[PDB]
Symmetry: D2
Subunit: 380 residues, 4 copies
């Protein structure tokens, strides 16, 4: 039939894939090749990566997909394909770190100017648009406090003023949020997170209209970034995404239990999780997201030293900066990642001294809660 | 000891690699991971790719290496790290195709201007340099007639006028040519060709000073192209380069036999191969290159239709646009790759209607010569 | 801590694995090596496969694990380690096909005699035991009608008469059944099915006492079958088993829905599924198994030609002889696998002309039911 | 054409392989699958492993090939397919270690008796043959002193008395010796050594008549050992064997240089290498082998402690028990492998206290000789 007609779990398993016609092999073969041969002068890929691109296009409800070497390369291949010297971008402030350096330093050195705004306030996006604006760029939920962006409202604003909307959907995966259905033009992912889900692949994906994807492929990849994804990485990502539906269900079930535990804990001052009623944009989240996600941020009493003591006291949670793996991962941005940054700068970059970020995995939630309770008790 | 002190074949086998300290594993483990874990807050890669980078740095006699997703990404990560709007590049005209589009269209849209010159004439390079020139870019030997560029002379010119020299060494590999030893600042490769050699990896490498490579890594890769190489691709390239010395010796031994056969054939009007005395820059080749290479170009009598008939008549040689594999590969640019291009344009892009390009593999040269003789006889 | 102390889902994720001490890599590195190096004469693996063996030992609650090249090799390495000429085996009749040939022909040619019994009747096992009996061998649930064997009762019988009990736990996985906890001495799996779960690995595992596993390793593998598992296959199986808990939950949830649908369908004469109340050993199943499994057998009205027409009319279910993959798979033994076998022989081997076997995958059960309903309607 | 008609180097590159018809992929795809799908009931592998089997069959000049999980499994799958209780085997004494345990202990426990003889004396083979003898089994060259066996003469003897001849050709590879051309019936290899050559694959291969190979596959593998090779291991072996010709040429060129150096060294009492004129079977070697091999044994003055001191003093050669890798490997059996064995037993098992075994790699021979000279000087 047509894979676009089946239920979402069926699509997760089947879309973009079929038994090998030649051999009947059910698994997508790994076409680990660089060389393709022609039969004739007149009549003179990659099939593995093509399957991944088609599957993700189906899952995001877009026309076409393009796999890349990294999440970074998905974003830069996209924006460098769309923009040239003299052009302008309006970008959310609450965005991924390496994206910020690309937008803050790299783009301006190529004559491409960027205005950063608080995208939780759609009026700030509107006010920053210029005749030269080609692209509005947002991420949602956004780090570090998991604030949201109203995709449908921002898309309407962008389009009225003649710009494209590009959305980073990494945190959600297509299982939980579909920006193209809400009016975005282009979706990008780091598949490194939930789409692969197994913490063993660095890669990205771009999904959008065929017309744009062809330009991203034949100009962006070929003539600017060279950021192709290897066939083995595509095969692993295909393998990982088979369990996307059941993984996201369990991630989100576990995260909600852990978030409620943290909200009831007197040593925890704040808990940021879209699944909690006290989230500032809770109702927007319920319309825009099918599940509240696997990521939690929370603030422990006692600031910087309590945060340090807490992550040094966990025994099951692993200390790492990654997200979306099968293992529960924990990090303390003020002592770890943003440690060279001046306090007052971190402080309304949104990173308080006591802020902890947690990527909830597939372990028994009882074991994770026990580990957290033990570490919090010690840290305070 | 120090791997920088052993003979070149010993370095090919050993440089950048050692038994795994933890386990004693002799093969470099495949660190197929995205996530790395920290032991503490205070104390809070990729090891496979690191081994490849160190090996190639040793082989090129450079300080440091940086692996990339493709040969394209090696070149663009390099140039986009070095140049910003307002800067200038002097580039050889006789360069790889996708490189030309990057230099002709992409760079100028970022405000970076490029002048193309005939790099076989070092005076044209000098005459094109401007106060804004940051980089001189060359490839040697160069397609399609395997003309050469005098690296040492061009390096001297570039440096006197305050620019860096970047050399694409893909065609030669470090076994046959070492541009850094001749004064180049930066070497780039598509490892897709001879360094891997097995036609199953797309990838690139950049080699140069530690100071530059750190910028290419932490700014170029991280903040512009995102073009990282996957650990499995790095492991395969490490595996392939183990036989670099013995592969290049046989490629070049076979190519010289085939080139001499073609030079004696009355249906072949011209043969381009640096190992032949009639090559226009033969003596330069003997000083600059340790072996004349595995690539041959030649012109068959009868123009476009003879070229078409010839490649349609080979039965052992395979029709493909790739180079540097273990199989002998053949292509006819006028009918294949550059077929949409207007004849008169191709004609002193250097591509005549009868031009055939041959990548000589590891087969018995007698079998390749027999296949060629048969196909030439039919085609004419 | 000790991985033997956490909840089962936590064990699935973490047991046998830890961040690489040397590098911090979270994923288990792929030690694709044959050679291990020594530091000295005095002081003169595989680490990937070791992680898999330790994980499965923890999940089955056994002391030690041994990975093999195939499910077949797990069974034969076990039995050939335990038995020599003159010894005797009592085996269930309702067993996997290739196992039957090994037991029926191969063992007797080595002087090892085998008696086959109906293991659903523990008294038949007792009556077949001899002074020479070393091993009782069973599989449960058993094909093709998913009959059960009471592991605890059979273990007691075997042990009283001085024999070991070996159980094939492939159909269940350790998530759903733990034979060692019920008194079995040794468990074997084809990891090809649910433990890997992704239809891309052929492999086996043996779990039991350290004393036995050492003999299976240093004598069975090294000196009889040579059936080692490759490190890459072990790494893929480690990756697959990460989602074992969530996969089995969904397989079993989907299978129960599909089984109830089939039980209500007037064109379906019988449905065999341990989760249905009418299963002959339903209560035994509830004590012995935590979930009823992902495999269903059923008989369609109209015998051989209806069965043929049905499998030729499915459009989502895939025709294959495999089990335990993420895709729903279907087969018709009488027309497919056992087609060369005489009808009357198949008929109380348990294989009726109308019998269909179904491996339920991770698709939306509504889509699978719709596909089945369509195919059944056509077939009848 | 027919790959059986090209030169041996051409066969090494091309035999068993072709561009993928479906996609044009030049590299053999990795069919990492367990499941194969059928299109119909009526019409209801592995393609990667099949390519390897066909290539090695062509190279050994046999009809068919069968890949296995290990060299051990190649040997045991073969012999257990051929022999049953009551049968007899005549085997060389000078054979690989794990093979000896299989033949000495395992076979007799299955009622299969084995007589061990000195196969350098063909008359000992004849004298040991019995009416029950099914197989004569030899290895050549043989460890540890690299003695030879006259394959053609032994084949004639075996056949006159109605037995098959099985030859282990691991040490030589098909590039240097072709036992089937000399009258052997069956050839086995550990591909772990030279056929793969890169020290990262454990695997075996069996080559012989189609009639036998079908029995080894459908009975030996399926119903006795279960020792299949994984598709990824087959793909790596295919990749490794591409350079077999150029690797063996360099291994043997380097080994001859090193052997001549050792023969001239006054601290070295004996050197065992078929390429040296003083080898006891030198002329037989020249008829039977195209090159003298990459393996050298030699005795250092001063017995056990000198041998220990020597291997502890090398700085380039690596200490390991493996053979046939790209790195030079060294071992001292009396202190390392056979250390638990009583001296007088080792002593005319052929292992003297001063015996060193060397696997010569692809490094510059000057560097290896320098390392050896340094270590020998220290050790004495
Ligand atoms: C991690 C991340 C990226 C970058 O992904 P890589 O594959 O590591 O480059 C981009 N966007 C978001 C939202 C991320 O979390
Ligand atoms: C093929 C080639 C490249 C590009 O390599 P990819 O890995 O295919 O991007 C660059 N330079 C030269 C000289 C080449 O031949
Ligand atoms: C498939 C199967 C086996 C054999 O597994 P392989 O890995 O294919 O050898 C053994 N036992 C049972 C119960 C099976 O279903
Ligand atoms: C190493 C070796 C074997 C066994 O090979 P594995 O792949 O390690 O089982 C068999 N025969 C010979 C001659 C060997 O050297
Ligand atoms: Na699939
Ligand atoms: Na190595
Ligand atoms: Na892990
Ligand atoms: Na090939």
């Amino acid at each position: 039939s047509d894979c676009r007609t089946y239920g979402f779990n069926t699509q997760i398993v089947h879309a973009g894939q079929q038994p090998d016609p030649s051999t009947g092999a059910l698994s997508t073969p790994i076409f680990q090749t660089s060389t393709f041969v022609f039969d004739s002068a007149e009549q003179g890929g990659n099939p593995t990566t093509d399957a991944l691109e088609k599957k993700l296009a189906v899952l995001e409800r877009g026309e076409a997909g393009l796999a890349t070497a990294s999440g970074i390369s998905a974003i830069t291949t996209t924006l460098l394909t769309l923009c040239q010297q003299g052009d302008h971008i309006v970008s959310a402030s609450a965005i991924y770190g390496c994206t910020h350096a690309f937008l803050s330093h790299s783009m301006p050195k190529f004559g491409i100017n960027v205005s950063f705004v608080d995208a939780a306030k759609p009026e700030e996006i509107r006010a920053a648009m210029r005749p030269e604006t080609k692209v509005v760029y947002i991420e949602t939920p956004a780090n570090p406090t998991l604030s949201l962006v109203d995709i449908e409202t921002v898309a309407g604003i962008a389009h009225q003023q003649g710009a494209l909307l590009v959305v980073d959907n990494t945190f959600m995966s297509p299982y939980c949020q579909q920006p193209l259905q809400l009016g975005a033009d282009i979706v990008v992912h780091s598949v490194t997170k939930y789409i692969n889900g197994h913490g063993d692949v660095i890669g990205g994906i771009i999904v959008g209209k065929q017309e744009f994807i062809d330009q991203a492929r034949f100009v962006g990849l070929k003539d600017i970034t060279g950021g192709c994804m290897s066939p083995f990485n595509a095969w692993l990502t295909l393998r990982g995404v088979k369990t996307l539906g059941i993984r996201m269900e369990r991630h989100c079930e576990n995260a909600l239990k852990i978030a409620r535990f943290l909200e009831g804990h007197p040593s925890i001052t704040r808990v940021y999780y879209p699944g909690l009623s006290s989230h500032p944009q809770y109702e927007l989240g319920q319309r825009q997201m099918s599940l509240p996600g696997g990521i939690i941020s929370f603030e422990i009493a006692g600031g910087l030293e309590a945060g340090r003591r807490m992550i040094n006291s966990v025994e099951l949670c692993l200390l790492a900066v990654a997200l979306g793996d099968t293992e529960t991962l924990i990090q303390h941005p003020a002592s770890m990642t943003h440690s060279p940054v001046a306090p007052e700068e971190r402080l309304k970059a949104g990173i308080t001294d006591g802020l902890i970020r947690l990527s909830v995995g597939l372990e028994d939630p009882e074991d994770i809660i026990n580990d957290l309770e033990h570490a919090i008790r010690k840290a305070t």
